Amino acid sequence: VTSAVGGAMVGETVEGIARYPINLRYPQSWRDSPQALRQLPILTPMKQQI
Amino acid sequence: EELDNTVRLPGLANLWVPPIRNRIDMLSTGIKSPIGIKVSGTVLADIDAMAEQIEEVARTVPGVASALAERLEGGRYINVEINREKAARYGMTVADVQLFVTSAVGGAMVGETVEGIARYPINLRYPQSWRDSPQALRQLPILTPMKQQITLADVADIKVSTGPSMLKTENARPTSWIYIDARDRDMVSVVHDLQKAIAEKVQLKPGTSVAFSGQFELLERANHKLKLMVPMTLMIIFVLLYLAFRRVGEALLIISSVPFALVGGIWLLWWMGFHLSVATGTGFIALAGVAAEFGVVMLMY
Amino acid sequence: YVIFEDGTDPYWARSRVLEYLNQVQGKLPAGVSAELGPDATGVGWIYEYALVDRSGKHDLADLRSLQDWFLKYELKTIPDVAEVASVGGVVKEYQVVIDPQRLAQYGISLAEVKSALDASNQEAGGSSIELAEAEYMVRASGYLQTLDDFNHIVLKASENGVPVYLRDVAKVQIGPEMRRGIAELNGEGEVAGGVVILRSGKNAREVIAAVKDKLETLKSSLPEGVEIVTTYDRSQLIDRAIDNLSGKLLEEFIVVAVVCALFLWHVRSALVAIISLPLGLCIAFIVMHFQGLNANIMSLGGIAIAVGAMVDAAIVMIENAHKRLEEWQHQKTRWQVITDASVEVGPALFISLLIITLSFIPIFTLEGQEGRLFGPLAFTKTYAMAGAALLAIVVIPILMGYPLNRFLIRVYHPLLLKVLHWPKTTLLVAALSVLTVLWPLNKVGGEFLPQINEGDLLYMPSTLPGISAAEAASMLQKTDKLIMSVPEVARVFGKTGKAETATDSAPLEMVETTIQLKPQEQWRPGMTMDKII
Amino acid sequence: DVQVIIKTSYPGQAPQIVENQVTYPLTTTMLSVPGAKTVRGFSQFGDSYVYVIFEDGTDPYWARSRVLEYLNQVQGKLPAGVSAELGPDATGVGWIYEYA
Amino acid sequence: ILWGTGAGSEVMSRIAAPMIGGMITAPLLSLFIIPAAYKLMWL
Structure with missing residues (x-):
């Protein structure tokens, strides 16, 4: 919920004195509307597709 | 002098200073030596080259005993x-x-x-x-x-x-310090000689500045203060003199006696081998009052 | 917001609040951290500018980076600047879009992707090695600097197999962050800018001049085709107020001189006042310096009436001295006339000045926000009147260093004779007027402040919560283009959202537009402020 | 003078990295402290020192109390494991007694 | 304190030298300049 759909920061690249965040998110097509959330692919710890 | 001549040990720039004064200097300015030059800027290569040039030119002044610049790279x-x-x-x-x-x-x-x-x-x-x-x-x-x-x-x-081995920055800007050591000649004399030399035979570069620090900054501050402090003393003396004689004539008459005091003081200073410092400034500011007091006594009688 | 009682030292309160801040930093989530607000109040925002690009070379991300990493650190070093907060623009970020299909294909979870991303963006220690006399310190790379570095990240390594890189599973690109606030110039387009905040209770003119000089000297090192357009500054309003006050005071002194020349037949006794009215004010300000009490616009507007109340003693002294030195002429050592004649009116004037000075303690009485706003006015008035009392007591040497009236006395005398013959009637009419005065009192409402106008305006619409990030920009541009159409506005700077500071807490639907108006000499025939609004 | 020392440890980081990520945000942040005359600072292979010298007639403890606030304000930006520690209540001239 | 040679005598000797130097020149001259100028002023 927070990573695939939310897109939370997972690090920062250092470019001298600056610092730019890094993201991790699914494509826009998989998180467009509630009907798209009801079909969000999930990979269980045992590598099952649901 | 004996210590400096006995421990040459090629590979070191000797420096001898009292502990308390040395630490107070390092606290107020950061430069351990009495005289020092800070080369500021933003590029490290330009600062290093300028410090090298200044260090190489400074050791030609007759009064300087040694000069060493801190390398950044x-x-x-x-x-x-x-x-x-x-x-x-x-x-x-x-x-x-x-x-x-x-x-x-x-x-x-x-x-x-x-x-x-x-x-x-x-x-x-x-x-x-x-x-x-x-x-x-x-x-x-x-x-x-x-x-x-x-x-x-x-x-x-x-x-x-x-x-870089270590990055020294003053006020969020890289700086390079140059330690000068001169024990035989005066302080202000060698400072003026170095100013003239590094303003004559060394060209500046855009983006870098050169500033004399150490005892010279405090000396200049105290000098300006003492220069602007004399009018207040003279005015207080004149006011308290009018308060006693109730006439401007006698007040100016006896207040015109401090110049002789200054002449005598500077003559004795030259004769004793002392230098002009803040201590002598305080001495003069105090001698003015004693001269005025003697004049008051004489003129009252 | 932790609100303390009235009369507490702001630094004391800040220290007390921070004393209990460290106990909570360990209980919050991993990534978040609480920050204290600046050292400024609502009067902190003094200067605002925008980074305009007069070309199509630099995008919004470049301008935002320029503001964040170059101008922010160059404008903070100013002594009395609390903080310079950025607003608008875009924050570049590295977006790694994952593919669920490839995740299922290669059988990899998001946790291992995060772990591989975390273990590839650092540098290692290089503790010096025991080399020859020349000591060498090691250094290992590892920072991420390009997209090709992102692509070559090992997610899953299998013995005697084939490793799985990040490129086979995801797509790395550079994109914008989720914007929380957007600024914009005139309908032209969006921009990025900054806001300068002033420390609590400092000089605004000095810091504004310093930051303007800093920006002027720094404008050389800016990229090609990038300009800094100012959008607000208090210096203009403060200078206007100071000029207005100075003009009014000069006009008052000129009027005093004209009256002295008209009623005393061309004598320079006016000087006795022109040198005694300013001196008094000086004393006041000196006292003000010993108890802080910075000078606002009200304390500056009050001296115009302070001098009008002070001139009475000077005029009375001058008039009595003239009368006595003219009476002497019927019958410079012999100018004991000027000093005896002075002391026969001195004490009454002194005690009158004392009562008018002490009659202001009911304005020091009230405390709270009323005392906080009206205090300085009463204080400057009281100190000015006290100084005036002292001077009037010692305004004698200045008095010694330097027609139409018969009509007045001829009109006054018969009226007096007619009034003395009916004293009870006069007192009755006086009481009748004092009673009739009860009509407007109950017909006039009571208001705490007047509305004081400034040369600028602020547009803020009440809106609804639901709003997206693109519709917000569209609405902002539309409102800016509509406001810029009025023939009197000179520049509009709109902002929807916050400005990356603890003092700004506006949602993404709240829009605040600063509007600068042309000088009054150019607006139009008429067209007062009310008509403009 | 009134001096406050800020010593930060960054294990095994070249002078440039520790100067960009540790010393610069501290030297630029301490210049906004009320009454800060100058802010010297230098970073070495593993450490970073920052000396804040204040104006004249400043309370030796008011300065520390005001530096603590900005230390807290800047702590949120430092690297993961780095933590800026305040210096002692003495200066370099305080070396009174020494033995061996 | 002028002829002193001890601990901390440098600053005191430097502060005292100007005063001792001036208290030999200002009074010796005043003794003749005060009566002269005063006689000139009384006429």
Whole structure:
């Protein structure tokens, strides 16, 4: 919920004195509307597709 | 002088100073020596070159005994560019390949053991035979996550280069200090001589400045204060003199006697071999009042 | 917001609040951290500018980076600047879009992707090696600097197999962050800018001049085709107020001189006042310096009436001295006339000045926000009147250093004779007027402040919560283009959202537009402020 | 003078990295402290020192109390394991007695 | 304090030298300049 759909920061690249965040998110097509959330692919710890 | 002549020891720029004064100087300004020059700017190469030039020109002044500039790029590095493609071909992240230099060739701490109240750290590193020369690093044995045997040259390119050893910044700007040592000649004399020299036979570069620091800044501040402090003293004297004689004539008459006091004071200063400092300024500011008092007594009688 | 009682030292309160801040930093989530607000109040925002690009070379991300990493650190070093907060623009970020299909194909979870991303963006220690006499310190790379570095990240490594890189599973690109606030110039287009905040209770003119000089000297090192357009500053309003006050005071002194020349037949006794009215004010300000009490616009507007109330003693002294030195002429050592004649009216004037000075303690009485706003006015008035009392007591040497009236007395005398013959009637009419005065009192409402206008305006619409990030920009541009159409506005700077500071807490639907108006000499025939609004 | 020392430890980081990530945000942040006359600072292979010298007639403890606030304000930006520690209540001239 | 040679005598000797130097020149001259100028002023 927070990573695939939310897109939370997972690090920062250092470019001298600056610092730019890094993201991790699914494509826009998989998180467009509630009907798209009801079909969000999930990979269980045992590598099952649901 | 005997100490300086007995401990030459080529490879050192001798400097002898009292402890309290030296530490107060290092606290107020940061430069240990009495005289010092700060080269500021934003580029390290320009600052280093300018400091070298100034240091080389300063040791020609007849009064200077020695001059040494702090080098910024005086640090030797062993750069290990970890190639990510090769490091990936063997299946090992960057951290897994730099752990072979942060702990084996390093020895970073891992923990601390307690004994009653005391505490002592633990270390972990490889033997000494694996940090002899860069060629000994390129032959470092690497145990990949694939349980394979390879060297460090197959995943990274290691070379030797130069770079900064320590970055000194004043007011968030890099600066380079130049320590001057002159014990035979005056202070203001050598300062003016160095100013003239580095303003004549050395050209400035855009983006870099040169500023004299140390005792000279405090001297100039105190000099300006003492220069603007005389009118207040003269005015107070004149007011308190009119308060006693109720006439401007006698007031000015006896207030015109301080110039002789100043002449005598400066003559005795020259005769005794002393120099003009803040102590002499205080002495003059105090002598004015005694001269006025003697004049008051004489004229009252 | 932790609100303390009235009369507490702001630094004391800040220290007390921070004393309990460290106990909570360990209970919050991993990534978040609480920060204290600046050292400024609502009067902190003094200067605002925008980074305009007069070309198509630099995008919004470049301008935002320029503001964040170059101008922010160059404008903070100013002594009395609390903080310079950025607003608008875009924050570049590295977006790694994952593919669920490839995740299922290669059988990899998000946790291992995060772990591989975390273990590939650092540098290692290089503790010096025991080389020859020349000591060498090691250094290992590992920082991420290009997209090709992202692509070559090992997610899953299998013995005697094929490793899985990040490129086979994901797509790395550079994109914008989720914007929380957007600024914009005139309908032209969006921009990025900054806001300068002033420390609590400092000089605004000095810091504004310093930051303007800093920006002027720094404008050389800016990229090609990038300009800094100012959008607000208090210096203009403060200068206008100071000029207005100075003009009014000069006009008052000129009027005093004209009256002295008209009623005393061209004598320079006016000087006795022109040198005694300013001196008094000086004393006041000196006292003000010993108890802080910075000078606002009200304390500056009050001296115009302070001098009008002070001139009475000077005029009385001058008039009595003239009368006595003219009476002497019927019958410079012999100018004991000027000093005896002065002391026969001195004490009454002194005690009158004392009562008018002490009659202001009911304005020091009230405390709270009323005392906080009206205090300085009463204080400057009281100190000015006290100084005036002292001077009037010692305004004698200045008095010694330097027609139409018969009509007045001829009109006054018969009226007096007619009034003395009916004293009870006069007192009755006086009481009748004092009673009739009860009509407007109950017909006039009571208001705490007047509305004081400034040369600028602020447009803020009440809106609804639901709003997206693109519709917000569209609405902002539309409102800016509509406001810029009025023939009197000179520049509009709109902002929807916050400005990356603890003092700004506006949602993404709240829009605040600063509007600068042309000078009054150019607006139009008429067209007062009310008509403009 | 009134001096406050800020010593930060960054284990095994070249002078440039520790100067960019540790010393610069501290030297630029301490210049906004009320009454800060100057802010010197230098970073070495593993450490970073920052000396804040204040104006004249400043309380030796008011300065520390005001530096603590900005230390807290800047702590949120430092690297993961780095933590800026305040210095002692003495200066370099305080070396009174020494034995062996 | 002028002829002193001890601990901290440098600053005191430097502060005292100007005063001792001036208290030999200002009074010796005043003794003749005060009566002269005063006689000139009384006429």
